[PDB]
Design a protein around this ligand. Structure first.
Ligand SMILES: *[C@@H]1O[C@H](CO)[C@@H](O[C@@H]2O[C@H](CO)[C@@H](O)[C@H](O)[C@H]2NC(C)=O)[C@H](O)[C@H]1NC(C)=O
Ligand SMILES: *[C@@H]1O[C@H](CO)[C@@H](O[C@@H]2O[C@H](CO)[C@@H](O)[C@H](O)[C@H]2NC(C)=O)[C@H](O)[C@H]1NC(C)=O
Ligand SMILES: CC(=O)N[C@@H]1[C@@H](O)[C@H](O)[C@@H](CO)O[C@H]1O
Ligand SMILES: *[C@@H]1O[C@H](CO)[C@@H](O)[C@H](O)[C@H]1NC(C)=O
Ligand SMILES: *[C@@H]1O[C@H](CO)[C@@H](O)[C@H](O)[C@H]1NC(C)=O
Lengths: 135, 581, 581, 135
């Protein structure tokens, strides 16, 4: 609905979570080769909470076989790596986050991944994204 | 209507399409968050009736104008948040009324200058946040001399490019001021010679400022004269970064006196930057998110009293011989280093959690070289092989192994030397208690956390006979099915006993009859069918007795118990949601 | 007065006070131990009645004299044990009657020479043990010409001081002889020049022979010309040891052709003595009980095909990149060590068990540098953090993690690339199964041992849908309380299912329909009351059903199941021993 | 009681186990100081079984609190460190075994240790010593 990209081994797309729809424009350059990618994740938005303690709950399914909740932290609260960690509720966020990975072997098929963004200090949901991956 | 989280104190008004201050909603609250509403213009006297108010949040409220005397009767307020309102200019008397304000956040308000910013009257002010605005000058205005409680000014992400001596004159003539300055994300490319002569700062944060290492180099040279308690330097991963990061960029630092030094992420990093001589007299050294791979060539005359390595990339456990080091933290390391013997005679605080560390032959004097250790944290690591029972480390008060893989701990009395230990956490260590003497020596111990382990024959054995000072005992998720007689008889001071998420088929009064101090007993998520023994013999001090999520047996042969449930229901928690099985 | 261990077959007459072979003992007896009885003398025709005797133990029977025809009737005896009897002199005719003897043990019988030892007609002899006697000569007697089946002679712990050219003439004149020779614990001080020219040995053991480094150098020099399949060298902790051990002592082994080289305990080991140039062409290298601290030497030209390192003391994982190494063993090492990347193109067999090994980033091609790994044993180790699912190692056919701590194994399909895997053991790894796709990719798997783990909510879930070729599955001690519906439907080839020592309240017959090939089902040590779900569905192939040590409620309300015992009687195990509860 | 020695921190004695009395003279030079000792264990006997796979079961008790059975392997059956490992049933063994250790903190008073020597190939008990240590 929001974004779409294609790679040699994956097609990637997302929409907002059905019952949580706070705006975020997010994009990766290049599109993700699951076997191995280097690039930037572009993110533009106005967060609804302080990013000081930002982390993600990730809910993954592979062909309807679901993974345990994967908790991934981005801002720990002390000398964080990223510019956005310091952003407050209401403040505009516009940045390019680099990334790299060497690539595991993934079952071919249909992946679902809802990505909930949490402000770890208040436990409030900031935004939620519903990802579709075809590998 | 607004979402009310707390009855007559706190109100959530987010994205509620409000264009005004809610009049028909209760005038009684202390905290109100009004963010993300299209207010457009903030009328005057809008907050007349609210006078019990302490905290007010107006983030991204589309506010273009702050009308004269808008903060009418707000004199208890201490926190005002104005983030993302395009108000641009504040006319004199903007904050008149706010006579007890501690914290002012004006982030992204199109603030162009501090000079004309009408906060001269607010003597109570502590923290000023003007990040993400259009301030081009670093100039500290004279009305700051009126602001005699000011301790932190945030000027992050503005357009400040220069610092002059005159910019900092305020501090020069006012040595008694304790001020801290975050100047991150400013494109600073020139600092006047001697700008920092005769100025004290508490903390100075300079992250992601310089584009060239040469501009960085020369700027640091003109820090000369500065007295900083804490200096924080570095970059961000998602920003402009320096190509090459030589320690020779850091040469201006030996002409600044630094109590505490913090380095954060850097694109390039040379291991021997920690060896750099201009950091020798620092009392606290910190590196966080740094690409350090080795730490072994540290001079003995270095004065470091604490050293903190957080989220770095060590390939080997640092070899350390620092004689005045009191506190060492190495945590969240990328790899899986294994413990290597160290020589730190001043060391009293040691935190080695979250590194997937392996430790063979834990633990005694010869591993650390100190007799002063009071805190040892080895939690969230890999295999830890117990081989010595803490000879030479009997000052230990706090010991944490939670979630690590302890070995051989039941092979002998692994804690025998620890007569001063107050806190012990061996939860989720995959320990199977096979030995009644496992806790021998632990006579001072208050807190025993040992969740997620197991016992031989799923029976709770006499392992507590001499842990007499226990006030907190967690035995949850221990696959328990039985309790040997007499196990708790010695624990006269125990206050909380958690035995939830086991497999007990019933309770017995006599296990608890000597727990004269017990206030909380948690037996939820067992398979409790009833309790036996003299029911009136449960500790009289009992207040919270959790029996939810069990399988109570509503049969006529458990009547004394079922009767007892009703009389003692004040103390049973969620009694009214309890259902028969 | 003898103990009967196997009726009419095996009898234990040890340590009575017998002066003679007891005569009430069955005629058919195959095995008799008569050691530690004062017999003093073996009278002629003593064992006449025992015509089928195969094994005879007469150790420490104080025998000074063997008479002619003592063994007359014993045509079937293959083993004769005479240890510790002071039979100083053996008459010609001592061994007559032993037509099938294969193993002669005459340890510590005060024997002085092989020339006079009357065994020239023991044509069937495979093993000759004459350790701990008074033998002074190394001379292989000419009657060895009759001994065409002999493969091992043990000359250990005697008085042999020299080896001469004439000593080994028999071997020189007979290149076809496949002989092995234990020469340990002899005070050898000289080997004649050219003594070992034209000689071939299968195994030569030389442990604990030398007191002086100079003597060992000069003795190994005159080993020139020898072809050995297996040379075993080294010393003992409880014996006279070498003062210094230099690689240069090994000089001499350059003129010996060695297939396999074994180094045992050495008092004064140096790391470079296994790097020695005269070992380059060996095809198997072995260290056992050796104080090696580091292995980071090994030149690439070295032709080693197997390296075996057992109960050694490595402080670091050895850096290795030998082009030819097909087989690496590193086991029972001291302390902990953390795995380090190696580069082994030919590597097909890797055993890294029992080392308290740490392994961060298991496991892929870049860890090992091979594509042909068929066997990987990582059992009895420390924390093994799964980071990679075996990309590049798809030939893998045997994988063992038993008793090690696996981490992150449920965070993805950790075995996905292992389409050829036959055997997988993840027993006792503290894995909590909470991802249905944990065994994805294991479509060739035959054997799955996962005892001692757990499942989310203690319910056995749909993890076997893709493991079609499973014949053996072990789920004991998994704390199971429940079984999901179609969990076994796919396992058409399954022969054995151990589900013992769980917490199953009852069985359900529908779970085991589709298990058409199930011979053994083991449900012992559960809390099983009864079985439900139509008893016809239990497999027709079901030969051994274990319902022992359960809690069956004996009444009439589940009388259907209690009726299945009759016709299915030979099929249940310990049928007539089961008790109600 | 077959033997005893006194040390600066322990008095050690042993007797034969009640129901297994195959003879062994075992002694140590010097007497073991639990806080650390360098020395030799003198052993002179004639084993009632092969020593190739000799291990020990140790059943230890501290003031009537017993430890889990401890198993000490001495001969693994392959390239072993001690000469006696090769000793057969009925053979004269006379050897002195070096030992060394630094010393853990031990409680307190009264130790019981029964030591069962076992031939690992046959699982036959070889000899059994009842040790008493006062520390
Ligand atoms: C007793 O121990 C258990 C953990 O084993 C605690 O359980 C947690 O309780 C909270 C409710 O306050 C739940 O939301 C969590 O899910 C539970 N944690 C788990 C299952 O890990 C319990 O709170 C402890 N009792 C006391 C009195 O501290
Ligand atoms: C089912 O698995 C269990 C493991 O829990 C096996 O139980 C063992 O049985 C042997 C006898 O064969 C006993 O000596 C042991 O006491 C048990 N071992 C352990 C480690 O507890 C049982 O053998 C399995 N069933 C089959 C057919 O293999
Ligand atoms: C727990 C238990 O005793 N299980 C037994 C097992 O030992 C044996 O191997 C099997 C077939 O012989 O019968 C069942
Ligand atoms: C061969 O064994 C026979 C059997 O009696 C004996 O006569 C002969 O001397 C033996 N050969 C040698 C070389 O001893
Ligand atoms: C020689 O004998 C040994 C037994 O020690 C045997 O294992 C080996 O295979 C034999 N070699 C040949 C070629 O028969």
């Amino acid at each position: 609905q929001q974004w779409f990209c294609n790679s040699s081994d994956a097609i990637i797309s997302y929409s907002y979570c059905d019952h949580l729809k706070f705006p975020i424009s997010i994009s990766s350059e290049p599109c993700i080769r699951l076997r191995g990618t280097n690039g930037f994740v572009h993110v533009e938005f106005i967060p609804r909470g302080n990013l000081k303690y930002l982390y993600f709950n990730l809910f993954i399914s592979v062909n309807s076989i679901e993974l345990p909740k994967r908790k991934e932290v981005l801002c720990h609260g002390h000398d964080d790596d990223y510019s956005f960690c310091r952003a407050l509720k209401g403040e505009t966020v516009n940045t390019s986050i680099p990334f790299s990975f060497e690539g595991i072997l993934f079952p071919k098929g249909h992946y679902r991944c809802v990505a909930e963004a949490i402000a770890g200090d208040t436990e409030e949901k900031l935004f939620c994204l519903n990802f579709t991956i075809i590998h | 209507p607004c979402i009310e989280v707390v009855p007559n104190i706190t109100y959530q008004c987010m994205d509620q399409k409000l264009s005004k201050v809610p009049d028909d909603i209760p005038s009684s609250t202390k905290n109100i968050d009004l963010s993300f509403n299209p207010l457009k213009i903030l009328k005057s006297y809008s907050f007349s009736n609210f006078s019990e108010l302490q905290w007010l949040d107006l983030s991204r409220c589309e506010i273009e104008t702050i009308e004269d005397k808008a903060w009418h009767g707000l004199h208890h307020l201490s926190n005002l948040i104005l983030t993302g309102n395009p108000i641009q200019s504040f006319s004199p008397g903007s904050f008149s009324g706010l006579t007890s304000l501690e914290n002012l956040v004006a982030v992204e308000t199109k603030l162009a200058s501090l000079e004309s910013f009408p906060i001269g009257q607010l003597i109570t002010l502590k923290k000023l946040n003007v990040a993400h605005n259009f301030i081009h000058s670093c100039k500290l205005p004279a009305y700051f001399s009126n602001l005699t409680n000011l301790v932190h000014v945030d000027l992050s992400y503005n357009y400040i490019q220069t610092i002059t001596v005159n910019d900092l004159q305020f501090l020069r003539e006012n040595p008694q001021v304790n001020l801290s300055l975050d100047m991150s994300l400013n494109p600073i490319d020139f600092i006047q010679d001697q700008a920092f002569q005769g100025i004290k700062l508490h903390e100075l944060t300079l992250r992601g400022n310089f584009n060239s290492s040469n501009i960085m180099k020369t700027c640091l040279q003109n820090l000369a004269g500065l007295h900083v308690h804490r200096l924080i330097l570095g970059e961000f991963k998602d920003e402009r970064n320096l190509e090459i990061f030589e320690p020779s960029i850091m040469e201006g630092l030996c002409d600044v006196t630094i109590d505490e030094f913090r380095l954060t992420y850097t694109n390039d990093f040379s291991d021997d930057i920690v060896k750099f001589h201009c950091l020798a007299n620092v009392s606290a050294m910190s590196l966080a998110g740094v690409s350090i791979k080795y730490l072994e060539d540290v001079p003995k005359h270095f004065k470091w009293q604490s050293l903190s390595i957080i989220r770095c990339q060590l390939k080997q456990f640092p070899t350390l011989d620092l004689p005045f080091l009191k506190s060492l933290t190495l945590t969240m390391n990328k790899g899986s280093i294994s413990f290597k013997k160290v020589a730190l005679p001043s060391l009293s605080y040691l935190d080695l959690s979250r590194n997937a560390l392996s430790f063979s032959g834990c633990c005694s004097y010869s591993d650390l070289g100190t007799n002063s250790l009071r805190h040892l944290d080895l939690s969230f690591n890999g295999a830890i092989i117990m081989s010595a029972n803490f000879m030479g480390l009997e000052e230990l008060q706090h010991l944490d192994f939670q979630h690590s893989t302890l070995k051989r701990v039941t092979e002998f009395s692994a804690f025998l030397s620890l007569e001063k230990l107050l806190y012990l956490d061996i939860s989720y260590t995959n320990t199977k208690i096979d030995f009644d003497g496992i806790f021998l020596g632990l006579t001072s111990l208050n807190t025993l956390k040992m969740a997620g382990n197991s016992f031989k024959d799923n029976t709770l054995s006499n392992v507590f006979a001499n842990t007499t000072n226990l006030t907190f005992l967690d035995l949850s998720k221990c696959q328990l099915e039985q309790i040997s007689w007499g196990v708790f008889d010695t624990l006269h001071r125990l206050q909380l006993l958690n035995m939830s998420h086991n497999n007990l088929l019933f309770l017995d009064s006599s296990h608890y009859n000597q727990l004269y101090s017990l206030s909380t007993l948690d037996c939820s998520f067992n398979r409790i069918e009833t309790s036996k023994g003299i029911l009136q013999h449960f500790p009289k001090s009992l207040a919270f007795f959790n029996l939810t999520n069990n399988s109570v047996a509503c049969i006529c042969e458990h009547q004394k118990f079922l009767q007892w449930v009703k009389e003692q229901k004040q103390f049973l928690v969620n009694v009214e949601q309890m259902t028969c099985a």
